[PDB]
Every structure is written in structure tokens, then in C-alpha cells.
């Protein structure tokens, strides 16, 4: 014909971005309950004064200053808080 009709793709789908990542970095002063990192799995583990939610959201269990550190035999990344 004058023009050749094309096909169709089968890859159009994608899901919404979940806004994961670190919310407060090292040195941030946070209130109790502040979300530090939103995660899939425990890439960062909960240290002192830090709690882990059902979806592994790390949140502050006290007022203070955020600190990242590496601890344990496995060199895992822990998030703790110095109470200030």
C-alpha cells in the first residue's frame, strides 16, 4: 500500500515511583518519630534509638542527631542516634 501499517508494542507498563531513599542524612537533628530512611528490605539496619517498621522504615525513637556507622562482623550499615 501507500503506507505500511506497523505493529504494536507490549512493554508499555511501569509502576509509580515509591519515593524511597534516605530522608535525613548524617548530622540531621530529628524529632522522635521522624523517618530517616524508607527502604525495600534492610539495606540500613536499626541501631541505638532507631526503630524498624513493618516495611523496614527506619524512624527515630528519640530526639537527637542522626549518625550512620558500620558495625558487626558482616560490615552492615547501622543507623543510630546520639541523644542531644
Amino acid at each position: 500500500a501507500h503506507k505500511k501499517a506497523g505493529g504494536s508494542t507490549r512493554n508499555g507498563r511501569d509502576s509509580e515511583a515509591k519515593r524511597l531513599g534516605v530522608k535525613r542524612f548524617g548530622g540531621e537533628s530529628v524529632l522522635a518519630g521522624s523517618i530517616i530512611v524508607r527502604q525495600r528490605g534492610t539495606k540500613f539496619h536499626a541501631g541505638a534509638n532507631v526503630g524498624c517498621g513493618r516495611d523496614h522504615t527506619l524512624f527515630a525513637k528519640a530526639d537527637g542527631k542522626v549518625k550512620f556507622e558500620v558495625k558487626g562482623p558482616k560490615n552492615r550499615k547501622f543507623i543510630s542516634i546520639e541523644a542531644e
Partner: protein, 136 residues
């Protein structure tokens, strides 16, 4: 016709051919064909060069292919408009950076190996040069 037996995915992004090469030394044979320019070597191009180069030396010595076509290239058919998904895989190519050794040769005299690589480089789009093995 060099081509991967199976691939994890059948199509790949266009990408960019930047940087210098890895594998710039004659590691297997005694002589080598080294790419001076950059570009794409199709499997047909590589195989045509291999036929001339192996036939030049009267099937003597040993011939090494140092490059492999692992990047699939898609082409839209004639007279189809833009869009409607990505095109179909037509052929495969290897990306070539300046300095990469494309072919190696051993077991033959240097004057014969030089002549064989001349005929072989006549089939390649990229500028080449003749190199020999060195002790590092």
C-alpha cells in the same frame, strides 16, 4: 558468522563508543592487527576478513579472532513510519575502540603475516596497523 548462542535479552540500547580500548597487546600469537580508529565491526565484516586472512597464509600457522559480535543492531523495515515499538534485530556488531587488537597470528613468517593482514584489513571499515608481540 560469529554470534552469541543465546542472550539474556534480544535488544540493547544504542549506547556510545567512547574511551580507549582494553586488550591492546599481542597476548596469544606473535603478530596482530590493531585498530587505530573506532567504530563497529559486523559479524559479516569480521568473518570476511577472517576468510581472506586465513586463506592468505595457505591454512598454515594458527589464527585467533580477538573480537566478538555481542551487540545486536535493529533496523526498521523499508517504508515503515517512526514508533510502533523498537525494530527487529538484523545483525550483530562489536564496538571497537582505538588500540584494540582485532586479529592475532602465529606460526608463519613475519613477511607473510604482514601481507595477510593487508588483505584482511582491506575488508574492515576502521583504520588498522600491524603489531608484533613484545615482552613487558
Amino acid at each position: 558468522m560469529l554470534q552469541p548462542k543465546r542472550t539474556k535479552f534480544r535488544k540493547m540500547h544504542k549506547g556510545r563508543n567512547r574511551g580507549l580500548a582494553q586488550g591492546t597487546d599481542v597476548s596469544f600469537g606473535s603478530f596482530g592487527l590493531k585498530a587505530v580508529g573506532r567504530g563497529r565491526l559486523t559479524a559479516r565484516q569480521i568473518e570476511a576478513a577472517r576468510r581472506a586472512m586465513t586463506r592468505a597464509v595457505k591454512r598454515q600457522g594458527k589464527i585467533w579472532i580477538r573480537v566478538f559480535p555481542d551487540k545486536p543492531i535493529t533496523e526498521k523495515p523499508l517504508a515503515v513510519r517512526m514508533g510502533k515499538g523498537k525494530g527487529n534485530v538484523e545483525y550483530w556488531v562489536a564496538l571497537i575502540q582505538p588500540g584494540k587488537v582485532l586479529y592475532e597470528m602465529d606460526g608463519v613468517p613475519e613477511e607473510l603475516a604482514r601481507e595477510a593482514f593487508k588483505l584482511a584489513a582491506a575488508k574492515l571499515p576502521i583504520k588498522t596497523t600491524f603489531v608484533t608481540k613484545t615482552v613487558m
